[PDB]
Amino acid sequence: AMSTLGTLAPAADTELFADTLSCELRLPAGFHVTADPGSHATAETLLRSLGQVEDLEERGELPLLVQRMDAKLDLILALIGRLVRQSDTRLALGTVHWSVRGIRLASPHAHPPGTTGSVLLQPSDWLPELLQLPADVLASASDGQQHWLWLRFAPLGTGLQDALERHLFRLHRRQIADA
Amino acid sequence: LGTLAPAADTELFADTLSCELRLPAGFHVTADPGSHATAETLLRSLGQVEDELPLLVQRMDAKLDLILALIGRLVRQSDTRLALGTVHWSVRGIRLASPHAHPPGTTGSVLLQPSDWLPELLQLPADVLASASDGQQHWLWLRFAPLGTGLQDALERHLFRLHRRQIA
Amino acid sequence: LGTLAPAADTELFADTLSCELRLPAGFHVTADPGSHATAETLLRSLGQVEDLREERGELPLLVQRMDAKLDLILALIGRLVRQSDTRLALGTVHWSVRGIRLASPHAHPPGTTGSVLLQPSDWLPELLQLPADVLASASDGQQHWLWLRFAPLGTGLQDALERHLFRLHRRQIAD
Amino acid sequence: STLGTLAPAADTELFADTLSCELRLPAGFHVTADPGSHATAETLLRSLGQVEDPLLVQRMDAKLDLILALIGRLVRQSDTRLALGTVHWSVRGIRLASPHAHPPGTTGSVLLQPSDWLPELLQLPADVLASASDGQQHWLWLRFAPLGTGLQDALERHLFRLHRRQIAD
């Protein structure tokens, strides 16, 4: 906590993180000008489904035919995840500051404020799926060895916003948890 | 406008719901058509996922969503893709733009993507009624071969639902 | 088009349901294929989804919707598999629970072992693989014909194949 | 198997007083700082064990079988296969052949394909205990890092069934 990167874009850092849960973490992240995010519902579905399956009984209240079905789903899911890792290009690992409003992350190339595009993020880790969020560049600055971008997400809509808030809240208690 | 083959235009759309929309679609010549079951399953399934029980079932559903999402993306990122474009679609046939003209009577299959998030294509065997060009290019008038009870009921529901969505 | 191998045609098709149909099939000379379990799972599952094509509402609405998602996933994965698989040559074949007679691009001596490769359903890009040996290879006007005798199937697979063949027959008489 | 005499201390640490299965399967050790995931490993093992065993529902189950089979095929297209060799496996660690030898203390991940009909791999973080050669190949004695209650139980169940199955005829 207490990273000075915010001194590079005071007004932007305040817009994105003031008075709202903001998490500083490392995960595959990136920004691309030529969007192709998809829908709010896809992002929302990814986040919610991800929550229902994660964060660390069948013989009872349930038969056994359904346990097998659930087993098969776990297997299919793992295999489809394996398939994806085979072709998709992974995002680079980076330290980012993420809130419901936007994100501060490092980028190979600077981009003037006003540039529009999509923030790419791999939320999970065991699942090679990306969360894409349309966003605009609020600020762009360097610290000497990396170009930093402050991106503000375009309106997320009621459902996705909720899923994202829950997502951030969970990540936060867990980071504090394993401490 | 449409009246560059009024003969077919009337056969395909007169007195029946005919929607005008933009969706990837195309005509592919072949003697190897698809199946009615497959097309019916595709249509009804898209519709049943329009908009609970023990926790294990709720998480099974979450797992399904994740699988569908991942598999859907893989297809969409590696496919040929059909030509986006304005088409006129009814339970009887479709009015779409094709790269080249075709002699009427030419047998083949109309391939269209009924939904855009899901990259699964709908395959319907059809014959060309007319092939007049003018919109700088060649427009085709395709007549679906008899769909059969089930698939026809599915297609009408699809178009009706699709129309209200649009008319709102 | 069967006298080319009298005894072999009698061993594989005498006093037993034998169907004549066209589908992608081939014989692959391989050391060891295997897995009756995979072959049986395929045939039994196909049959259930084949019949799908008991009660409309019935169970919870959520369930019906999950089933739909399954139909979508299967279709999508099917499409993906076709984007890079190798289609097998379509051909007429005589198929019994004991063996199969098909057209091969080349001939093989009696005793050659491998797997009979078949695509059971046109809508599903999945292949059925059954270990088999060649007990007859002869030629007629042109094409090379092989008589493959399946290696023992085991209780389950046999039942699955017999069921599959019977339904195939029944549907065939439906013309 | 006399491979143990090549590294008595390690062989004893990994297989003494515990079920140890000698079998053939694709398995490898790769130097990496990939912490893997206990939850992923446990899910794989329990699910595997589950399948190693109203009409609408039965149809759904049929669809799952078909999907699983196809997805399996896809992965097997462009996936880097593991080396199939004889191994010695216990809940504590595993002895397997390796391309290069490694100094004891070297940490990485053991990769192996639990079932032969599915291309899904199990990853388990481990450290090299011993590393010796029999004149033909380099053998490694890897000690899995703590598995955690759940994963450990799943693995114990997995090895026990495996041992049972193989004691037939």
Numbering used by the authors:
A (entry chain C): 0 to 55, 62 to 184
B (entry chain B): 4 to 54, 66 to 182
C (entry chain A): 4 to 56, 62 to 183
D (entry chain D): 2 to 54, 68 to 183
Sentences from the paper on this structure:
Four such XCC6012 molecules are intertwined into a stable tetramer via the heptad repeat α3 helices that form a parallel four-stranded coiled-coil. The quaternary structure of XCC6012 is found to adopt a novel “house-like” architecture, with a central pillar domain comprising the four vertical α3 helices, a roof-top domain comprising the eight inclined α2 and α4 helices, and four corner-stone domains comprising the PilZ domain. In contrast, the clipping treated with the xcc6012 knockout strain (XD62 #2 and XD62 #86) did not cause as much damage as that treated with the wild type strain.
In brief, Se-Met substituted XCC6012 was found to form square-shaped crystals belonging to the space group P21, and contain four monomers and four acetate molecules per asymmetric unit. The final structure was obtained by repeated refinement to a resolution of 2.1 Å, with values of 22.0% and 24.6% for the Rcryst and Rfree, respectively. In addition, XCC6012 contains only a partial c-di-GMP binding signature motif (SxxG) and a long sequence of 57 amino acids comprising two α-helices (α2 and α3) after the β1 strand. But unlike other regular four-stranded coiled-coils, XCC6012 is further surrounded by four additional α2 and α4 helices, forming an intricate 12-helix bundle architecture. In the surface of the coiled-coil, a pair of salt bridges between residue Lys77 at position g and residues Asp75 and Asp79 at position e and b, respectively, are observed, which stabilize the coiled-coil as are generally observed in other helix bundles. These altered hydrophobic residues are responsible for forming additional type II helical interactions. While wild type XCC6012 exhibited an unfolding temperature of 57.1°C, those of the K77D and D75K variants revealed unfolding temperature at 44.4C° and 53.9C°, which are substantially lower than those of the wild type by 12.7C° and 3.2C°, respectively.
